[PDB]
Scaffold this active site. Sequence first.
Site, mmCIF file in Angstrom:
data_model
loop_
_atom_site.group_PDB
_atom_site.id
_atom_site.type_symbol
_atom_site.label_atom_id
_atom_site.label_comp_id
_atom_site.label_asym_id
_atom_site.label_seq_id
_atom_site.Cartn_x
_atom_site.Cartn_y
_atom_site.Cartn_z
ATOM 1 N N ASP A 87 14.778 -1.762 -8.578
ATOM 2 C CA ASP A 87 15.517 -2.930 -8.191
ATOM 3 C C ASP A 87 14.811 -4.093 -8.882
ATOM 4 O O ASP A 87 13.713 -4.552 -8.418
ATOM 5 C CB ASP A 87 15.611 -3.097 -6.666
ATOM 6 C CG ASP A 87 16.087 -4.490 -6.230
ATOM 7 O OD1 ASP A 87 16.451 -5.294 -7.114
ATOM 8 O OD2 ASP A 87 16.088 -4.783 -5.026
ATOM 9 N N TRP A 136 8.695 -1.544 5.547
ATOM 10 C CA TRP A 136 9.336 -0.245 6.017
ATOM 11 C C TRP A 136 10.107 -0.370 7.341
ATOM 12 O O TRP A 136 10.685 0.594 7.778
ATOM 13 C CB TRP A 136 8.269 0.847 6.154
ATOM 14 C CG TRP A 136 7.689 1.266 4.832
ATOM 15 C CD1 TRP A 136 6.722 0.614 4.135
ATOM 16 C CD2 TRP A 136 8.017 2.436 4.060
ATOM 17 N NE1 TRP A 136 6.437 1.282 2.989
ATOM 18 C CE2 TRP A 136 7.220 2.393 2.897
ATOM 19 C CE3 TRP A 136 8.911 3.494 4.232
ATOM 20 C CZ2 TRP A 136 7.284 3.365 1.897
ATOM 21 C CZ3 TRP A 136 9.002 4.435 3.241
ATOM 22 C CH2 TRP A 136 8.192 4.374 2.092
ATOM 23 N N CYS A 179 10.403 6.042 -4.607
ATOM 24 C CA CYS A 179 10.797 5.443 -5.860
ATOM 25 C C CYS A 179 9.682 5.613 -6.890
ATOM 26 O O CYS A 179 9.947 5.938 -8.041
ATOM 27 C CB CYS A 179 11.141 3.972 -5.718
ATOM 28 S SG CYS A 179 12.630 3.671 -4.732
ATOM 29 N N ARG A 224 11.565 5.861 -10.662
ATOM 30 C CA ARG A 224 12.829 6.561 -10.916
ATOM 31 C C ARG A 224 14.004 5.602 -10.661
ATOM 32 O O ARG A 224 15.127 5.794 -11.207
ATOM 33 C CB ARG A 224 13.000 7.780 -10.016
ATOM 34 C CG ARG A 224 13.321 7.441 -8.568
ATOM 35 C CD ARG A 224 13.754 8.593 -7.670
ATOM 36 N NE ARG A 224 13.722 8.154 -6.268
ATOM 37 C CZ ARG A 224 14.661 7.332 -5.730
ATOM 38 N NH1 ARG A 224 15.789 7.101 -6.408
ATOM 39 N NH2 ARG A 224 14.486 6.787 -4.526
ATOM 40 N N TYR A 237 4.579 8.702 0.773
ATOM 41 C CA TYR A 237 3.407 8.452 -0.081
ATOM 42 C C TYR A 237 2.097 8.872 0.619
ATOM 43 O O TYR A 237 1.383 9.796 0.266
ATOM 44 C CB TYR A 237 3.383 6.980 -0.507
ATOM 45 C CG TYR A 237 4.625 6.485 -1.220
ATOM 46 C CD1 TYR A 237 4.895 6.842 -2.532
ATOM 47 C CD2 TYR A 237 5.555 5.655 -0.581
ATOM 48 C CE1 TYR A 237 6.045 6.385 -3.183
ATOM 49 C CE2 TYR A 237 6.704 5.197 -1.207
ATOM 50 C CZ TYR A 237 6.958 5.577 -2.512
ATOM 51 O OH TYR A 237 8.118 5.193 -3.124
ATOM 52 N N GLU A 278 0.168 -2.256 2.653
ATOM 53 C CA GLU A 278 0.916 -1.015 2.335
ATOM 54 C C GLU A 278 -0.002 -0.089 1.542
ATOM 55 O O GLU A 278 -0.090 1.088 1.831
ATOM 56 C CB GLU A 278 2.238 -1.253 1.591
ATOM 57 C CG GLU A 278 3.037 0.019 1.224
ATOM 58 C CD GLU A 278 4.294 -0.216 0.366
ATOM 59 O OE1 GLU A 278 4.236 -1.040 -0.605
ATOM 60 O OE2 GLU A 278 5.375 0.393 0.658
HETATM 61 O O1 LIG Z 1 9.162 -0.159 -4.252
HETATM 62 C C1 LIG Z 1 10.393 -0.091 -4.418
HETATM 63 C C2 LIG Z 1 11.096 0.550 -3.381
HETATM 64 C C3 LIG Z 1 12.484 0.619 -3.450
HETATM 65 N N1 LIG Z 1 13.130 0.149 -4.558
HETATM 66 C C4 LIG Z 1 14.609 0.162 -4.609
HETATM 67 C C5 LIG Z 1 15.289 0.792 -5.795
HETATM 68 C C6 LIG Z 1 16.672 1.011 -5.190
HETATM 69 O O2 LIG Z 1 17.465 -0.197 -5.246
HETATM 70 C C7 LIG Z 1 16.413 1.394 -3.718
HETATM 71 C C8 LIG Z 1 16.249 2.909 -3.452
HETATM 72 O O3 LIG Z 1 17.519 3.410 -3.849
HETATM 73 P P1 LIG Z 1 17.665 4.923 -4.056
HETATM 74 O O4 LIG Z 1 17.180 4.983 -5.481
HETATM 75 O O5 LIG Z 1 16.788 5.573 -3.023
HETATM 76 O O6 LIG Z 1 19.132 5.192 -4.177
HETATM 77 O O7 LIG Z 1 15.230 0.703 -3.428
HETATM 78 C C9 LIG Z 1 12.369 -0.514 -5.582
HETATM 79 O O8 LIG Z 1 12.975 -1.000 -6.566
HETATM 80 N N2 LIG Z 1 11.029 -0.598 -5.518
#
Ligand SMILES: O=c1ccn([C@H]2C[C@H](O)[C@@H](COP(=O)(O)O)O2)c(=O)[nH]1
Lengths: 547, 551
Positions: free
Chosen positions: A452, A343, A429, A449, A369, A321
């Site tokens: 997870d 993805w 994110c 921002r 990105y 990635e």
């Molecule tokens: O590298 C990553 C990519 C995605 N997310 C997660 C955070 C959220 O659970 C979801 C995206 O949710 P939105 O914030 O787009 O609502 O994917 C991560 O934590 N790290």
Amino acid sequence: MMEQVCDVFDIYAICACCKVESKNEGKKNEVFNNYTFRGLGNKGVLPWKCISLDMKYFRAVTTYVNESKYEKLKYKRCKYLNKETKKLQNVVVMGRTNWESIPKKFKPLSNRINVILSRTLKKEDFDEDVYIINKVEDLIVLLGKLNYYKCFILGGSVVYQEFLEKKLIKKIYFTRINSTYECDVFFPEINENEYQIISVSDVYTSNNTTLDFIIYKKTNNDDEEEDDFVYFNFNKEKEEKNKNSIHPNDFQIYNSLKYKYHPEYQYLNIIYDIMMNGNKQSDRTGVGVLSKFGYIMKFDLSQYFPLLTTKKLFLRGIIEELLWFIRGETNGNTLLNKNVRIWEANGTREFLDNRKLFHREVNDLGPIYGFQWRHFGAEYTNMYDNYENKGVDQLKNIINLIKNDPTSRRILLCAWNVKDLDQMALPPCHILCQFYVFDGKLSCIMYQRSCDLGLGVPFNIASYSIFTHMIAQVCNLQPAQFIHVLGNAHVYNNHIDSLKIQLNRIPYPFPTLKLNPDIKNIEDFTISDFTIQNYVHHEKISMDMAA
Amino acid sequence: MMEQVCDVFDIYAICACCKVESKNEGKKNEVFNNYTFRGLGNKGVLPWKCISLDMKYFRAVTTYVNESKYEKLKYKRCKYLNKETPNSKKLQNVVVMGRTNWESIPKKFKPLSNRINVILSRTLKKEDFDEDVYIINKVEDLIVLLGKLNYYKCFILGGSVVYQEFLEKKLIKKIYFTRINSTYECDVFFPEINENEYQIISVSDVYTSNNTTLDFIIYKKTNNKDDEEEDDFVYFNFNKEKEEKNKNSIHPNDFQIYNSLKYKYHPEYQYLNIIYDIMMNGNKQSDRTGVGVLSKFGYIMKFDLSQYFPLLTTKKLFLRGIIEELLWFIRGETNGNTLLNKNVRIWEANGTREFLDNRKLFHREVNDLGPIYGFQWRHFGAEYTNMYDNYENKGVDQLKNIINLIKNDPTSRRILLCAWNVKDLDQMALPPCHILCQFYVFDGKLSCIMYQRSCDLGLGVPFNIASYSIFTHMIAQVCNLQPAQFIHVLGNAHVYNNHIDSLKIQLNRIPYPFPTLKLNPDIKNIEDFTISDFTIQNYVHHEKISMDMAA
Ligand SMILES: O=c1ccn([C@H]2C[C@H](O)[C@@H](COP(=O)(O)O)O2)c(=O)[nH]1
Ligand SMILES: NC(=O)c1ccc[n+]([C@@H]2O[C@H](COP(=O)([O-])OP(=O)(O)OC[C@H]3O[C@@H](n4cnc5c(N)ncnc54)[C@H](OP(=O)(O)O)[C@@H]3O)[C@@H](O)[C@H]2O)c1
Ligand SMILES: CCc1nc(N)nc(N)c1-c1ccc(OCCCOc2ccc(-c3c(N)nc(N)nc3CC)cc2)cc1
Ligand SMILES: CCc1nc(N)nc(N)c1-c1ccc(OCCCOc2ccc(-c3c(N)nc(N)nc3CC)cc2)cc1
Ligand SMILES: O=c1ccn([C@H]2C[C@H](O)[C@@H](COP(=O)(O)O)O2)c(=O)[nH]1
């Protein structure tokens, strides 16, 4: 309840154990446990040439005393024997083999009362100021007589064995050396019902291995401005918030630990803090979370690579990635042809159509990105176009300010292109990262921002850690701190059971990352220029329990 | 005198003191000091109807006992007097209050639950009373009643007079002093404390209770005339530097009042301790401006806007310019003259011929600051031409979009306002320091993160804290939510070498409780605010500091 010897006379054991060369015990599916670390010696010397931080740790523990605590230990010891009434030193005890392997110029050990265990050898045979004994019983009698702070067993495989057999060790001060060597002597398997870990140190690098320090404790089988603290805590609330749904009984071990200094705990404690004090909230996906808002974590990439150890993680996919980003790609098929599916779900016909991207080919992810790092500003057409010298090449920009204007406060890479969000398969994110340079060292802040915690934060830490090493090497700098800022930090409702399990695992020393040093340009890395060394981990976890 | 009187018997004052209405002055030009807080009472009541957090606290400091520390205190007590004093099963504290004071309490809550009550007077005596209560007649008569009693600590509640004298005569060990940050009419005042006798050693968090701010502080009598795992701790610290690195430029003795304090819980210390960390451990670096800095990388500050407004109190700050800047930003403006014709000079240096020319913007009119924050908030991605062009409905109205997301999808994690447009950077007078803020909503409350790429701790950060703290209020109100936390993330955090001396002074001052911010409540859209809709209340502060002390 009644007093045991080891309490009275403060007997402790102190070791340093490495990992042991086994052939045909495939490093492909190696299982790891506390016993992974067990190598004490080889051919009558240490397994390793010189790990100086264990030497320094060792001298610090074994020579340290607190005069103002001596009186207490004396009363406690005189009151045990129905008795009463130069510098205070510790006693150290070692076997004959151990002693015979230490060079003359270091024996007897400075500033310590040296004591040898030995059936064969005897006191007329020693020039040196040293006590000889030939039964563990005799050490008790001796400690009775001497004035000393604490007693340390410096080993011998055999000595450790029987002091542990007879429950005479009140604590083990164990150095885990996270590196492999040829060994012929071994530390006893420790009985987890008799001894359990109470403390874990920071993780360090010394002489080309990482390592940490843990403490096992024996399992049971002016003093005034302390009221002033109570006064200030007068607004100590009712109880907790999630003391209803989440039980502190669920984290028995997590909470059993006194000192939790290993840096994997900057991740684990945030998880615990969201479980115990999360806000319960709906989310875009429907699944639901406990959320909090605003944390910072810091990882010293000079001492270790922060690949979480409380569960397993592989890096192939996230490096690919990372290289796809750098190449400026937005084509999902490139990654699927390398059997990386990070993805896949964001480029299905069904997914794109939910984003209202009806005129977008499957797996064409749009200006994400890669595209923003190499072409910020340019008009996105389709994933097959030639975008050379269109847009702002942010990546080449920041490599040039690090090399040529290192004191600049404007060295930022930003994926959050307000104007293209809607055309992205989904909005980024990892909003941005900022670099900082001092004394030939590079640090990196990355602002996430949306985080997870269960499944994505672990990978993200690894991702921007590697990216920091890459940038540092193509700029002839060393990496220092990766700094991880978390905005919306959330635990998904389906991760809670796995996460209760994970937080009751005790971390191992982190691995290290090696890049091929020959790679001088950010664009010239390949998957094989990256090696992970000494990854020691607990079992893989399925963060969701349905699949 | 081989152990001191007050020491042995544990004598402690506890007070609460509001501010007092002087008659005809000018309150935005008045000096402040520890003495600013004096008001005790009015017409034999409290000056304030009811301040509930000071009640909770007052009871818990007087009712709280520790049985197990008592032995050591009994021991050293009987030992002084030369004697040997089983009784009321639970040990209890002595509270010591004059008649006036005793007589101005209601007898529904009398005597004071779980306290040995005392009184002073020459009008009353033992016989016309309970046997529970006691009474003495002079001061020296108290010491006597204590030594012949089982008590944990003794607390002077007193009254003007009672405090006035006890404190003449050096019989107070510590003062637990609630500073109530409002004004009220007062007849009876707490006495000017002599500084050579008492010094502050501890300052609490700042709170709101019944529509006022307050903190709790502690003065201490100045000197005039399992330890198992304590070692485990010492062994975990085996690898520490035996030295602070910038101790060759910046000495701990230059910080004597900062390091004197035991508990430093006031929220302003989150800013002051960052400065301290930088001055002691920062990295010597040069920068674009050529002054050089001490710098560090990555910190978080958090401020509870529900409890206070975090306007720094260790030096004087004004807010009109930064509010007019906020309003200029919300309107989309990039014209520097709009601020200069209101005498806000924040963006002046950046709009000069000289400065614009140094940015290679030779075809830009003076004070046309380019596509900066305002433009990006309201027109992100449009083509900039000049500060007078008409951009109605061009670009992305990020401000509008976040407001709709807070109102109609508050659990979105995509509520961000970004000012760092990579395509327009070089067209800006200078690139934004305030990269982005993110918003979060729970249970009817809004919080805000702001990330700042470059932070001038001496001059910039103080205004920056206030600026985005107001903005968070403004957004919360027009989305019918309550502010919660403003969280401020700092990237390149730097102390300018010319500001070192000034900060040294500043870090040696003790915060006052924070002011509060009021907005006009009629205002229901972010475009409708005007300067007059913003009122700072009860700003107590130290004197101004020129951070540049060149002029
Ligand atoms: O590298 C990553 C990519 C995605 N997310 C997660 C955070 C959220 O659970 C979801 C995206 O949710 P939105 O914030 O787009 O609502 O994917 C991560 O934590 N790290
Ligand atoms: N990394 C570490 O922290 C660490 C710690 C310790 C040792 N080591 C390594 O391990 C090697 C030695 O291992 P080992 O276990 O074979 O040697 P050892 O346990 O140090 O010493 C064994 C000797 O001590 C004596 N001994 C043991 N129990 C006794 C008892 N109850 N009464 C009387 N004497 C007793 C016996 O003496 P006699 O032979 O005279 O009967 C025996 O030969 C060293 O050379 C070193 O490299 C490493
Ligand atoms: C430092 C190794 C160590 N670390 C930890 N944590 N625990 C231990 N029990 C031990 C340990 C101590 C003694 C021991 O004896 C076997 C002999 C080989 O070990 C040596 C030999 C020499 C030295 C040495 C050295 N290389 N340099 C100095 N100055 N001083 C010393 C002696 C303390 C250290 C360990 C084995 C292990
Ligand atoms: C609680 C106020 C307070 N806070 C602090 N920090 N220091 C003090 N010395 C005092 C204090 C000052 C003067 C004082 O003198 C008498 C005037 C106070 O009048 C009162 C006091 C308490 C109450 C009251 C009340 N309103 N409710 C309850 N439950 N209990 C009580 C008794 C403490 C009612 C009227 C009593 C306490
Ligand atoms: O609101 C602001 C605006 C500017 N700065 C400071 C940070 C730097 O000292 C300087 C901008 O310099 P660069 O980081 O752009 O070089 O202004 C602030 O702290 N706050």
